[PDB]
Amino acid sequence: AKWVCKICGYIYDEDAGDPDNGISPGTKFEELPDDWVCPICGAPKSEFEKLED
Ligand SMILES: [Fe+3]
Incomplete structure:
Protein backbone atom coordinates (compact mmCIF):
# COMPACT_ATOMS: atom_id res chain seq x y z
CA ALA A 1 0.00 0.00 0.00
CA PRO A 33 7.54 2.77 15.06
CA ASP A 34 5.11 5.09 16.83
CA ASP A 35 7.69 7.92 16.69
CA TRP A 36 8.63 7.46 13.02
CA VAL A 37 8.08 10.74 11.15
CA CYS A 38 7.72 11.86 7.56
CA PRO A 39 11.34 12.03 6.29
CA ILE A 40 10.62 15.22 4.35
CA CYS A 41 8.66 17.43 6.75
CA GLY A 42 8.81 15.69 10.14
CA ALA A 43 5.06 15.11 10.45
CA PRO A 44 3.96 12.36 12.87
CA LYS A 45 2.28 9.17 11.67
CA SER A 46 -1.14 10.70 12.47
CA GLU A 47 -0.77 13.04 9.47
CA PHE A 48 -0.63 10.22 6.91
CA GLU A 49 -3.62 8.95 4.93
CA LYS A 50 -3.81 5.57 3.20
CA LEU A 51 -4.25 5.87 -0.57
CA GLU A 52 -7.28 3.67 -1.10
CA ASP A 53 -11.02 4.10 -1.18
FE1 LIG B 1 5.57 15.20 5.14
Missing part, protein backbone atom coordinates in the same frame (compact mmCIF):
# COMPACT_ATOMS: atom_id res chain seq x y z
CA LYS A 2 0.94 3.67 -0.34
CA TRP A 3 0.19 6.45 2.14
CA VAL A 4 0.42 10.22 1.65
CA CYS A 5 1.78 12.74 4.12
CA LYS A 6 -1.13 15.20 4.20
CA ILE A 7 1.28 18.02 5.05
CA CYS A 8 3.93 17.78 2.33
CA GLY A 9 2.86 15.16 -0.23
CA TYR A 10 5.62 12.64 0.51
CA ILE A 11 4.44 9.10 -0.33
CA TYR A 12 5.25 6.37 2.17
CA ASP A 13 5.38 3.41 -0.22
CA GLU A 14 5.33 0.18 1.80
CA ASP A 15 7.28 -1.51 -1.02
CA ALA A 16 10.04 1.10 -0.71
CA GLY A 17 10.16 1.42 3.06
CA ASP A 18 12.40 4.18 4.41
CA PRO A 19 15.86 2.60 4.73
CA ASP A 20 17.80 5.83 5.31
CA ASN A 21 15.71 6.16 8.50
CA GLY A 22 15.79 2.56 9.69
CA ILE A 23 12.85 1.02 7.77
CA SER A 24 13.41 -1.92 5.42
CA PRO A 25 11.47 -2.19 2.14
CA GLY A 26 8.21 -4.04 2.69
CA THR A 27 7.36 -2.57 6.10
CA LYS A 28 3.63 -1.88 6.50
CA PHE A 29 2.71 1.62 7.69
CA GLU A 30 1.08 0.18 10.83
CA GLU A 31 4.42 -1.43 11.74
CA LEU A 32 6.41 1.80 11.53
Whole structure:
Protein backbone atom coordinates (compact mmCIF):
# COMPACT_ATOMS: atom_id res chain seq x y z
CA ALA A 1 0.00 0.00 0.00
CA LYS A 2 0.94 3.67 -0.34
CA TRP A 3 0.19 6.45 2.14
CA VAL A 4 0.42 10.22 1.65
CA CYS A 5 1.78 12.74 4.12
CA LYS A 6 -1.13 15.20 4.20
CA ILE A 7 1.28 18.02 5.05
CA CYS A 8 3.93 17.78 2.33
CA GLY A 9 2.86 15.16 -0.23
CA TYR A 10 5.62 12.64 0.51
CA ILE A 11 4.44 9.10 -0.33
CA TYR A 12 5.25 6.37 2.17
CA ASP A 13 5.38 3.41 -0.22
CA GLU A 14 5.33 0.18 1.80
CA ASP A 15 7.28 -1.51 -1.02
CA ALA A 16 10.04 1.10 -0.71
CA GLY A 17 10.16 1.42 3.06
CA ASP A 18 12.40 4.18 4.41
CA PRO A 19 15.86 2.60 4.73
CA ASP A 20 17.80 5.83 5.31
CA ASN A 21 15.71 6.16 8.50
CA GLY A 22 15.79 2.56 9.69
CA ILE A 23 12.85 1.02 7.77
CA SER A 24 13.41 -1.92 5.42
CA PRO A 25 11.47 -2.19 2.14
CA GLY A 26 8.21 -4.04 2.69
CA THR A 27 7.36 -2.57 6.10
CA LYS A 28 3.63 -1.88 6.50
CA PHE A 29 2.71 1.62 7.69
CA GLU A 30 1.08 0.18 10.83
CA GLU A 31 4.42 -1.43 11.74
CA LEU A 32 6.41 1.80 11.53
CA PRO A 33 7.54 2.77 15.06
CA ASP A 34 5.11 5.09 16.83
CA ASP A 35 7.69 7.92 16.69
CA TRP A 36 8.63 7.46 13.02
CA VAL A 37 8.08 10.74 11.15
CA CYS A 38 7.72 11.86 7.56
CA PRO A 39 11.34 12.03 6.29
CA ILE A 40 10.62 15.22 4.35
CA CYS A 41 8.66 17.43 6.75
CA GLY A 42 8.81 15.69 10.14
CA ALA A 43 5.06 15.11 10.45
CA PRO A 44 3.96 12.36 12.87
CA LYS A 45 2.28 9.17 11.67
CA SER A 46 -1.14 10.70 12.47
CA GLU A 47 -0.77 13.04 9.47
CA PHE A 48 -0.63 10.22 6.91
CA GLU A 49 -3.62 8.95 4.93
CA LYS A 50 -3.81 5.57 3.20
CA LEU A 51 -4.25 5.87 -0.57
CA GLU A 52 -7.28 3.67 -1.10
CA ASP A 53 -11.02 4.10 -1.18
FE1 LIG B 1 5.57 15.20 5.14
